[PDB]
C-alpha cells in the first residue's frame, strides 16, 4: 500500500523515495509527489485461484484479442499454482 | 597538372572539429566479436571504428543518462583494416588496431561419439 | 605522391593568397565593429583575426591551404554583407565559455577527462 | 480487469519510438513478475505517431482521447510511470470503449 | 596432399578429408542454419535445421554431420534446401510458446532470427500447445522449459565441457523433457555457460533477468581479472550501467567460456564502493573530504619519510599502469619496499628470468602435451578455464594427468601420486612408479600452482619441482622448444607485478616495518595494524571497502577494472588491456592518475601526464607489457635451474592441501566476489 | 516479413508474434541497392533517392 | 647507489646475439656474486637491446647494447656494477 | 453514458480531476527507480 | 502470377541496356562502368574529369535530351579513398526516361560545376559543398546554403556526430544567443539492430 517514509514522503509502488538529506526533495515544496495508489502487486494478490480439471490450461487474459498473447501453463507441480506470465492470474488443477 | 606533396594527408583543419576531440580521443579499430547468445556470424565481417568511452551521469530531474561527449554514438564502418587506419590517420585521431579473431578450424566427426575405446564415446544422445 | 592542385601549385604560391585574405579581413574589422555596433575595440577585433589565422599555422599541404583560403573568403563575405549578426561575429570571442584548465592537477580535480 | 498492470516491460514501444521519447527500466518484482520500475515518456520529444500503441503486444501503452493537457512549465510534460498510470485510471472508462470500437480494424 | 575438391553452389573448395558439408560452406562464406550443432560440442544431428540438398541426390543430408565426399555440389539455396528449412522451422514453432515479449532471449534469439531468415511467415497449426513444468536448478540459471527445443546442447556441454553428467533427457516422444529427473542443482564453476549455448530462452540468467534487451546495450570488449587466466569478455552497458558479462571468443585462452565468478560477480561492483576520499577526524573516524585536501595529507607525510620508512603493497586487482606509477613514486623517495600479497620464492633466480614464474607451455600448449603433472593445485577453482582446456585434451588427445597433492575432484580421472611433497624427491631420483609413464612421454608438462608456493617451505617446493623437471628434460629427451616447467597464478596483478620488479610477498615489510604504508588495493589481510609501528600512516587506494579500508588513515577512491583502460598480464605472460565501460562512481579516479596527482603535490612530479605516456614508461621497464595479445617466448630456464640447485632449503612433510577444496570456497575470493549478492546466494546454495 | 500481422494473429500464432517482434524492433532488411522514386506531388516532382 | 639492472633483448634478432651469450655464460656467476641485487632479463621480439640501471632516488641510465659481443657486454655490465 | 454506461472497474477514478497545472496539485516529475550504486559505510569506531 | 511480388516487366530493362552501351561507345574517355538495376534504372559511372562533357552530351544529344536535372547529391562512404560519390539524376521528357550519372570526389579534389549546363544545379552544388565539403570549380556563388552562419564542419559526413559539437542558448549576462559545447540531459541511445544472420544470399561477399 501507500506506506509513508519517516521523512513523510510517500513511497511509490516501485519502492522509490528520496532520502532525508537528498536535496531533490525541494521539487515537492508547495507541490506534491505524484503517486499511483492502486499497487498492482496488491491487486493481483486479491484474485482467487481458478481451479481447472485438465493439466494444461490456456490463458489469454480475457477479451480474446483484447488480452495478451495466448500461452499455456502446466499444472502438474501440485504444490504451487501455475501463474500466467503476462496477467499474473493463478491456476490450480481440480484433482 | 600534378604536383608533389611530400607529406602525409591531414584534413583536421577542414573538418571543423574542436581541438578537444582530435588530440585527446583514442579510436579503436576492430572487428566486432560475435555476440555469444547467437550463432550467426554476419556481424563479424566489417571493421568498426569507435571512440573511447567518456563519462555519463544521471540527470537530476529524471535520472536519464547525460553526456558531454559528442562522439559517444559515432561508429564508422570499413571493409578493410587498412581503410580504417587511413581514415583515422587523415583525421588525426590516435588509433589502436586489434587483429581479426577467426574461429580456428576444428575436427568434427559424428562417428567419434561411439568409439570402441576412446574417451570421446558419449554416454547419451 | 602526386595530386591535382586546387589553385596553388605549392605552399609559397598559396601563402600569397593567405596574405591577401588577411589584408581583406584586416580592412574589414573597423567596418564590422562600426556597422554591427559591436562592443569591442578595433585592436581587439584585429587581434582576434590574427588569432584565427594562427590557429592553422601548422598546415603545409598546399591543397589544404587552398580550402582554408576558400572558406575564409566565404567567412569574410558573410560579414561584409551583414548576413551574420552580432551573435555570429561575437561567437569567435567565446565570451560565455569558461576555458578548461590545461594543467594535469586541475583536470584531475575536475573529472575523469584527460 | 483485475487491476494488474498490462505492461510486461518488453521494451518494444521503446525500440520503435521514432523520437526516442520512451525510457524504460525493469526488474523482477517481489512476486517474480516482469514489470517496469521506470517508464517515462518525454511528451516534448513525442511526435504522437501512435507507433508505441501498435508495437505493444498487450495493449499496455495507449494514446487516449485527451488533448487538453497544456501546462505552465516544461517539466510537467515529462511523464513518469506514476503519472501515466494515473492517466490510465483517469481515462480507462473512455479508453476501453474506444478500443472496443476500433480493435477489429487492427 | 589429400585435399578433396567439393563445390558449394558451383564454387570449388579444397577441404581436408573428414570435413562436413557445414564446414565446407564456411569456407565459401555460406553459413548453414542450425540449432543443435555447436562447433565446440560433439555433433548431435537432431534439430534437422541443417538439411541441405546435394546435387543429384534425392534425399537431403544433415549438413552438420554428413561428411563431405569429393565431387559433391552442395546446393545451400535450392528449393529442397529452402523447403526443408521452412518445414523444420514450422515444427520447432508449433509447440513453442508465445513468450517473446516476456523472454530474455527476444532480440537475440536464434529461433526468432532464423525464423525471419529461413522460415515461413504464417502459422497453420490449429491445435493446443504443450506445457512442461519448470525445474529449479540453482540460483544462477533460470529454467523456463516450455521454451526448450530439445536440442541437447545443454546436455552435451555439461557432459563434455563441465564433466557433470547430471543433465539428460527423460521421457520419450513429444513428451521428452530435458533436466535432471530428481531435484538437483546444476552447480559448477562453468555452469553459467549453458545460458549462452542454449539457443533459446529455456536457460537464462537469473541475476540478469528482465533487466535489459540486447539492442539497448553497448558492448565494450574487455578482459576479466577475477583470475589470472585473463578471459576475454564483453561488458554490456546500458545508459552508464553494467548489465552483464559475456564471453568474447579467444581461441588460445578461454575459447567461448568463462567461469561463473567472471560471469556473475560484476554485481559486486555496485556495493561497498569507495566513492569519496576520506580522512580521519579528531575522534578517529573516517570523514569525507576533498581530493585536494586528501592528497595534501599524503604528500605531507610522504615528504618526511624516505627509504625503508615508506612501503607499498599491491593487491590482487591492480593494473600495470598503477604498479609502474606506484613504483616510480616510491623509488623517488629512495624506497624499494614495493611488495605484493602473493608469495613467490625469491631464492635462486627469483623474478630475474620471466621463464621462472610463467606458464611457459601456454594455455594452448596443454593440447599438445601427453602427460600433465599437477603439483599442489586445484586447477578447477584456481584456473577454471585452464582446467577446461585440460579436460578437452583429456577427452580428445587422451591426455594422461597426474596430481601431486590432495585428491580433489577435477571433473576427469587422474592418477593421484600422493600429497606429501616428498614425492618430488622420488620422481626426480627415478624411484616413484610414475616415472614409467614419464619415460614414455615426448611432451611432459609440470604445472606448479601458486597456491603451493604460499607455504612456509615455498622455496623448497619450487626448487624441488624445478629439479624434477631437469630429470624429465633428459629422462624423456625433449626438444629445446618444448617447455616443461610451469607456474599457475591465481591473481590478476601477480605476473605484471613481477614483470616490473615488485618484491613478491610482504616479507620485507615484516623485516623493516614502514612508517608509511601504501595499500594499493590490498585486501588479503597479510599486514595488519598489529604488524606495524604504533601510529603508522596507512593510505588505502582501492575501489571496495573490505579489509584494507577500515584500517586506513586516508582512503583514495580508485576505479575498478570495468572503469578504466588498464593492462593485465595473464598466467602465460600475455599482455592484454581492458577498456572503459562505465566511468568511476562518485569522486573515484583512475588509479594511475591518483599516484600522478599525489606525486605533483609532494614535489616529486612523475614524468607522465596521459595514459599514452604511462604505457611508454611501462615499455621502458618491461617492454612486453605493451605487446598486446602477444605471447613472448622466453628461454634461459636452464640458468634459473642452475641457480636453484644451490638453495639449501628443504621440503617439509606437510601434505599439499589447496586453499579451495570444494565449490563452496570458489565463489568468494577477492573484494568484488565478496561484495556480490549473487555470489552469496551461490555460497548459500551449495552449502544448504 | 515486411507488413506486420493482424493483432488477433499476433496473439495466437507463434510465427505471427515473432514477426511482430522483429518488425517493431529491428525492422525488415531491405536488399542492397539504390532507387530514385518520384511522384507528381501537389507542388511537383517529389523525389526520393534512397540507398 | 645502484638499485637495479634491467637487460632488454630480442630472442632471435642478431643485433642481440652478443647479449644472449652474455646471459648464458655470465648471469649465473654474476648472480652468485650479488645474490641480493635485482637483475631483470626481459626479452621481447624485435627490440633494441639495452641496459637500464636505476640508482638511488630513481635515477636511471641506459647503456645501449646494440651489436656488441659477449666480452664487450660483460665490460658494460661491469661498468654499471662497479662505477 | 446515461444509456451506455462504461464498464465499472475498481481502479477507475471515482472523482475526475481537471487540469491542475499551476496549482499545488500539479504533477512534478522525478525518477521512480531506486539508488543503483551503494557506497561503503565506514566503521563508527576508532581502529 | 504472384499477388505479393512486384510485376517485373521486360522491355524496359532491354531498352536501357541498349542505351547504356550507346552512351559508353560515344564517351569512352569518361565512362568507367554502366549498369542497370533490377528496378530497371540506368547508371553511368564516369571519371570526374568527364562531368561537364558527359552531362552536356546527355542534355543536347538528339537521342538523349536529358534536359531536366532532377537532383544532384552526394553519398559519403568512408571506406573508399574517394569517399564522396556524386550522383546526378537526369530526366528526359522527350523519351520519358531517367538516367543516373555518378562520379566521385575526395576532400581535396573538387569537381567541376555544371551550372553552365543546368542552372538547376546552382543550389544543389551549394548543398553538396555545405553538407559534405565538396568544392566545385567555377561555381558563380559557392557558399553555405543550409547550415547556420559560421557553422564549422560538414554535418552530412558520416564521421560528423548526429548532435553536432555546439548548441545555442540565450545568455542574459551578455544579452544574446551564445554557442557552447553540447551537453544533453539524455544521450541519444544507439541501438544495435543488425541481425547476425544473412538475409540475402544473392549479395554475399567472398571471404578472400
Ligand atoms: S506516439 Fe510518441 S511515445 Fe509513442 S512511438 Fe510515437 S513518438 Fe514515441
Ligand atoms: S508498454 Fe507495451 S510495448 Fe512498452 S514495454 Fe510495456 S508491454 Fe512492452
Ligand atoms: S526463445 Fe523466447 S524470444 Fe525466442 S522465439 Fe521463444 S519465446 Fe520468442
Ligand atoms: S534447454 Fe536449451 S540447450 Fe538444453 S535442449 Fe533445451 S533448447 Fe537446447
Ligand atoms: S544443426 Fe544439423 S541437425 Fe541440428
Ligand atoms: Na539461453
Ligand atoms: Zn494471462
CSV table of N, CA, C and O in Angstrom, one decimal, chain E residues 544-615:
chain,number,residue,atom,x,y,z
E,544,UNK,N,36.9,-0.9,-3.3
E,544,UNK,CA,35.9,-1.5,-2.5
E,544,UNK,C,36.3,-1.3,-1.0
E,544,UNK,O,37.5,-1.3,-0.7
E,545,UNK,N,35.3,-1.2,-0.1
E,545,UNK,CA,35.6,-1.2,1.3
E,545,UNK,C,35.5,-2.6,1.8
E,545,UNK,O,34.4,-3.1,2.0
E,546,UNK,N,36.6,-3.2,2.1
E,546,UNK,CA,36.6,-4.6,2.6
E,546,UNK,C,37.4,-4.7,3.9
E,546,UNK,O,36.9,-4.7,5.0
E,547,UNK,N,38.7,-4.9,3.7
E,547,UNK,CA,39.7,-5.2,4.8
E,547,UNK,C,40.7,-4.1,4.9
E,547,UNK,O,41.0,-3.6,6.0
E,548,UNK,N,41.2,-3.6,3.7
E,548,UNK,CA,42.2,-2.5,3.8
E,548,UNK,C,41.6,-1.2,4.2
E,548,UNK,O,42.2,-0.4,5.0
E,549,UNK,N,40.4,-0.9,3.8
E,549,UNK,CA,39.8,0.4,4.1
E,549,UNK,C,39.7,0.7,5.5
E,549,UNK,O,40.3,1.7,6.0
E,550,UNK,N,39.0,-0.1,6.4
E,550,UNK,CA,38.7,0.4,7.7
E,550,UNK,C,39.9,0.6,8.6
E,550,UNK,O,39.7,1.3,9.6
E,551,UNK,N,41.1,0.1,8.2
E,551,UNK,CA,42.3,0.4,9.0
E,551,UNK,C,43.1,1.6,8.4
E,551,UNK,O,44.2,1.9,8.9
E,552,UNK,N,42.6,2.2,7.4
E,552,UNK,CA,43.4,3.3,6.7
E,552,UNK,C,43.2,4.6,7.4
E,552,UNK,O,42.2,4.9,8.0
E,553,UNK,N,44.3,5.4,7.4
E,553,UNK,CA,44.3,6.8,7.8
E,553,UNK,C,43.6,7.6,6.7
E,553,UNK,O,42.8,8.5,7.0
E,554,UNK,N,43.9,7.3,5.4
E,554,UNK,CA,43.4,8.0,4.3
E,554,UNK,C,42.9,7.0,3.3
E,554,UNK,O,43.5,6.0,3.0
E,555,UNK,N,41.7,7.3,2.7
E,555,UNK,CA,41.2,6.4,1.6
E,555,UNK,C,41.1,7.2,0.3
E,555,UNK,O,40.6,8.3,0.3
E,556,UNK,N,41.6,6.6,-0.7
E,556,UNK,CA,41.6,7.2,-2.0
E,556,UNK,C,40.8,6.4,-3.0
E,556,UNK,O,41.2,5.3,-3.4
E,557,UNK,N,39.6,6.9,-3.4
E,557,UNK,CA,38.7,6.0,-4.2
E,557,UNK,C,39.2,5.8,-5.6
E,557,UNK,O,39.3,6.8,-6.4
E,558,UNK,N,39.6,4.6,-5.9
E,558,UNK,CA,40.1,4.3,-7.3
E,558,UNK,C,39.0,3.6,-8.1
E,558,UNK,O,37.9,3.3,-7.7
E,559,UNK,N,39.4,3.4,-9.4
E,559,UNK,CA,38.5,2.8,-10.3
E,559,UNK,C,38.5,1.3,-10.2
E,559,UNK,O,39.4,0.7,-9.6
E,560,UNK,N,37.5,0.6,-10.8
E,560,UNK,CA,37.5,-0.8,-10.9
E,560,UNK,C,37.9,-1.2,-12.4
E,560,UNK,O,37.9,-0.3,-13.3
E,561,UNK,N,38.1,-2.4,-12.6
E,561,UNK,CA,38.6,-2.9,-13.9
E,561,UNK,C,37.6,-2.5,-15.0
E,561,UNK,O,38.0,-2.3,-16.2
E,562,UNK,N,36.3,-2.5,-14.8
E,562,UNK,CA,35.3,-2.1,-15.8
E,562,UNK,C,35.4,-0.6,-16.1
E,562,UNK,O,34.9,-0.2,-17.1
E,563,UNK,N,36.1,0.2,-15.3
E,563,UNK,CA,36.0,1.6,-15.3
E,563,UNK,C,37.3,2.3,-15.8
E,563,UNK,O,37.4,3.5,-15.7
E,564,UNK,N,38.2,1.6,-16.3
E,564,UNK,CA,39.5,2.2,-16.8
E,564,UNK,C,40.0,1.3,-17.9
E,564,UNK,O,39.7,0.1,-18.1
E,565,UNK,N,40.9,1.9,-18.7
E,565,UNK,CA,41.7,1.2,-19.7
E,565,UNK,C,43.0,0.8,-19.0
E,565,UNK,O,43.9,1.7,-18.8
E,566,UNK,N,43.2,-0.5,-18.6
E,566,UNK,CA,44.2,-0.9,-17.8
E,566,UNK,C,44.9,-2.1,-18.4
E,566,UNK,O,44.3,-2.8,-19.3
E,567,UNK,N,46.1,-2.4,-18.1
E,567,UNK,CA,46.9,-3.5,-18.6
E,567,UNK,C,47.0,-4.6,-17.5
E,567,UNK,O,47.3,-4.4,-16.4
E,568,UNK,N,46.6,-5.8,-17.9
E,568,UNK,CA,46.8,-7.0,-17.1
E,568,UNK,C,47.6,-8.1,-17.9
E,568,UNK,O,47.4,-8.2,-19.1
E,569,UNK,N,48.4,-8.8,-17.2
E,569,UNK,CA,49.2,-9.9,-17.8
E,569,UNK,C,48.7,-11.2,-17.2
E,569,UNK,O,48.7,-11.4,-16.0
E,570,UNK,N,48.3,-12.1,-18.0
E,570,UNK,CA,47.7,-13.4,-17.5
E,570,UNK,C,48.8,-14.4,-17.1
E,570,UNK,O,50.0,-14.0,-17.1
E,571,UNK,N,48.5,-15.6,-16.8
E,571,UNK,CA,49.4,-16.5,-16.3
E,571,UNK,C,50.5,-16.9,-17.3
E,571,UNK,O,51.6,-17.3,-17.0
E,572,UNK,N,50.1,-16.9,-18.6
E,572,UNK,CA,51.1,-17.2,-19.7
E,572,UNK,C,52.1,-16.1,-19.9
E,572,UNK,O,53.1,-16.3,-20.5
E,573,UNK,N,51.8,-14.9,-19.3
E,573,UNK,CA,52.6,-13.7,-19.6
E,573,UNK,C,52.0,-12.9,-20.7
E,573,UNK,O,52.7,-11.9,-21.1
E,574,UNK,N,50.9,-13.3,-21.3
E,574,UNK,CA,50.3,-12.5,-22.3
E,574,UNK,C,49.8,-11.2,-21.8
E,574,UNK,O,49.0,-11.1,-20.8
E,575,UNK,N,50.1,-10.1,-22.4
E,575,UNK,CA,49.6,-8.8,-22.1
E,575,UNK,C,48.4,-8.4,-22.8
E,575,UNK,O,48.3,-8.6,-24.0
E,576,UNK,N,47.3,-8.0,-22.1
E,576,UNK,CA,46.1,-7.6,-22.8
E,576,UNK,C,45.5,-6.5,-21.9
E,576,UNK,O,45.8,-6.3,-20.7
E,577,UNK,N,44.6,-5.7,-22.5
E,577,UNK,CA,44.1,-4.5,-21.9
E,577,UNK,C,42.6,-4.5,-21.8
E,577,UNK,O,41.9,-5.0,-22.6
E,578,UNK,N,42.1,-3.9,-20.7
E,578,UNK,CA,40.7,-3.6,-20.5
E,578,UNK,C,40.3,-2.4,-21.3
E,578,UNK,O,41.1,-1.8,-22.0
E,579,UNK,N,39.1,-2.0,-21.2
E,579,UNK,CA,38.6,-0.8,-21.8
E,579,UNK,C,37.5,-0.2,-20.9
E,579,UNK,O,36.9,-0.9,-20.1
E,580,UNK,N,37.4,1.1,-21.0
E,580,UNK,CA,36.3,1.8,-20.2
E,580,UNK,C,35.0,1.3,-20.6
E,580,UNK,O,34.7,1.4,-21.8
E,581,UNK,N,34.2,0.8,-19.7
E,581,UNK,CA,32.8,0.5,-20.0
E,581,UNK,C,31.9,1.6,-19.4
E,581,UNK,O,31.1,2.2,-20.1
E,582,UNK,N,32.0,1.9,-18.1
E,582,UNK,CA,31.4,3.0,-17.4
E,582,UNK,C,32.6,3.8,-16.8
E,582,UNK,O,33.7,3.4,-16.8
E,583,UNK,N,32.2,5.0,-16.3
E,583,UNK,CA,33.3,5.8,-15.6
E,583,UNK,C,33.2,5.5,-14.1
E,583,UNK,O,32.2,5.0,-13.6
E,584,UNK,N,34.2,5.8,-13.4
E,584,UNK,CA,34.2,5.5,-11.9
E,584,UNK,C,33.1,6.3,-11.2
E,584,UNK,O,32.7,7.4,-11.6
E,585,UNK,N,32.6,5.7,-10.2
E,585,UNK,CA,31.5,6.4,-9.5
E,585,UNK,C,31.9,7.5,-8.6
E,585,UNK,O,33.1,7.6,-8.1
E,586,UNK,N,31.0,8.4,-8.3
E,586,UNK,CA,31.3,9.5,-7.3
E,586,UNK,C,32.5,10.2,-7.7
E,586,UNK,O,32.6,10.7,-8.8
E,587,UNK,N,33.4,10.4,-6.7
E,587,UNK,CA,34.6,11.1,-6.9
E,587,UNK,C,35.8,10.1,-7.1
E,587,UNK,O,37.0,10.5,-7.0
E,588,UNK,N,35.5,8.9,-7.5
E,588,UNK,CA,36.6,8.0,-7.8
E,588,UNK,C,37.4,8.4,-9.0
E,588,UNK,O,36.9,9.1,-9.8
E,589,UNK,N,38.7,8.1,-9.1
E,589,UNK,CA,39.5,8.5,-10.1
E,589,UNK,C,40.3,7.3,-10.6
E,589,UNK,O,40.5,6.3,-9.9
E,590,UNK,N,40.8,7.3,-11.8
E,590,UNK,CA,41.6,6.3,-12.4
E,590,UNK,C,42.9,6.1,-11.5
E,590,UNK,O,43.5,7.1,-11.1
E,591,UNK,N,43.3,4.8,-11.3
E,591,UNK,CA,44.2,4.5,-10.3
E,591,UNK,C,45.6,5.1,-10.5
E,591,UNK,O,46.3,5.4,-9.6
E,592,UNK,N,46.1,5.2,-11.8
E,592,UNK,CA,47.4,5.7,-12.1
E,592,UNK,C,47.5,7.2,-12.0
E,592,UNK,O,48.6,7.8,-12.0
E,593,UNK,N,46.3,7.9,-12.1
E,593,UNK,CA,46.3,9.3,-12.0
E,593,UNK,C,46.2,9.9,-10.6
E,593,UNK,O,46.5,11.0,-10.4
E,594,UNK,N,45.8,9.0,-9.7
E,594,UNK,CA,45.9,9.4,-8.3
E,594,UNK,C,47.3,9.5,-7.8
E,594,UNK,O,47.7,10.4,-7.1
E,595,UNK,N,48.1,8.5,-8.2
E,595,UNK,CA,49.5,8.5,-7.8
E,595,UNK,C,50.3,9.6,-8.6
E,595,UNK,O,51.3,10.1,-8.1
E,596,UNK,N,49.8,9.9,-9.8
E,596,UNK,CA,50.4,11.1,-10.5
E,596,UNK,C,50.0,12.4,-9.9
E,596,UNK,O,50.8,13.3,-9.9
E,597,UNK,N,48.7,12.5,-9.5
E,597,UNK,CA,48.3,13.7,-8.8
E,597,UNK,C,49.0,13.8,-7.5
E,597,UNK,O,49.4,14.9,-7.1
E,598,UNK,N,49.2,12.7,-6.8
E,598,UNK,CA,49.9,12.7,-5.5
E,598,UNK,C,51.3,13.1,-5.7
E,598,UNK,O,51.9,13.8,-4.8
E,599,UNK,N,52.0,12.7,-6.8
E,599,UNK,CA,53.4,13.0,-7.0
E,599,UNK,C,53.7,14.4,-7.1
E,599,UNK,O,54.7,14.9,-6.7
E,600,UNK,N,52.7,15.2,-7.8
E,600,UNK,CA,52.9,16.6,-8.0
E,600,UNK,C,52.8,17.4,-6.8
E,600,UNK,O,53.5,18.4,-6.6
E,601,UNK,N,51.8,17.0,-5.9
E,601,UNK,CA,51.6,17.8,-4.6
E,601,UNK,C,52.9,17.6,-3.8
E,601,UNK,O,53.3,18.6,-3.1
E,602,UNK,N,53.5,16.5,-3.8
E,602,UNK,CA,54.6,16.2,-3.0
E,602,UNK,C,56.0,16.6,-3.6
E,602,UNK,O,57.0,16.3,-3.0
E,603,UNK,N,55.9,17.3,-4.7
E,603,UNK,CA,57.1,17.9,-5.3
E,603,UNK,C,58.0,17.0,-6.1
E,603,UNK,O,59.0,17.5,-6.6
E,604,UNK,N,57.7,15.8,-6.2
E,604,UNK,CA,58.5,14.8,-7.0
E,604,UNK,C,57.7,14.4,-8.2
E,604,UNK,O,57.4,13.2,-8.4
E,605,UNK,N,57.3,15.3,-9.0
E,605,UNK,CA,56.4,15.1,-10.1
E,605,UNK,C,56.9,14.0,-11.0
E,605,UNK,O,58.1,13.9,-11.4
E,606,UNK,N,56.0,13.1,-11.4
E,606,UNK,CA,56.4,12.0,-12.2
E,606,UNK,C,56.3,12.4,-13.7
E,606,UNK,O,55.4,13.2,-14.0
E,607,UNK,N,57.1,11.8,-14.6
E,607,UNK,CA,57.2,12.3,-15.9
E,607,UNK,C,56.2,11.7,-16.9
E,607,UNK,O,56.6,11.1,-17.9
E,608,UNK,N,54.9,11.8,-16.5
E,608,UNK,CA,53.9,11.3,-17.4
E,608,UNK,C,52.5,11.9,-17.1
E,608,UNK,O,52.2,11.9,-15.9
E,609,UNK,N,51.8,12.3,-18.1
E,609,UNK,CA,50.6,13.0,-17.8
E,609,UNK,C,49.4,12.4,-18.6
E,609,UNK,O,48.3,12.9,-18.4
E,610,UNK,N,49.6,11.4,-19.4
E,610,UNK,CA,48.5,10.8,-20.1
E,610,UNK,C,48.7,9.3,-20.1
E,610,UNK,O,49.8,8.8,-19.9
E,611,UNK,N,47.6,8.5,-20.4
E,611,UNK,CA,47.7,7.1,-20.5
E,611,UNK,C,48.8,6.7,-21.5
E,611,UNK,O,49.4,5.7,-21.3
E,612,UNK,N,48.9,7.4,-22.6
E,612,UNK,CA,50.0,7.1,-23.6
E,612,UNK,C,51.3,7.1,-22.9
E,612,UNK,O,52.1,6.2,-23.1
E,613,UNK,N,51.6,8.2,-22.2
E,613,UNK,CA,53.0,8.4,-21.7
E,613,UNK,C,53.2,7.4,-20.5
E,613,UNK,O,54.4,7.0,-20.3
E,614,UNK,N,52.2,6.9,-19.8
E,614,UNK,CA,52.4,6.0,-18.8
E,614,UNK,C,52.7,4.6,-19.4
E,614,UNK,O,53.6,3.9,-18.8
E,615,UNK,N,52.1,4.2,-20.5
E,615,UNK,CA,52.4,3.0,-21.1
E,615,UNK,C,53.8,3.0,-21.8
E,615,UNK,O,54.5,2.0,-21.8
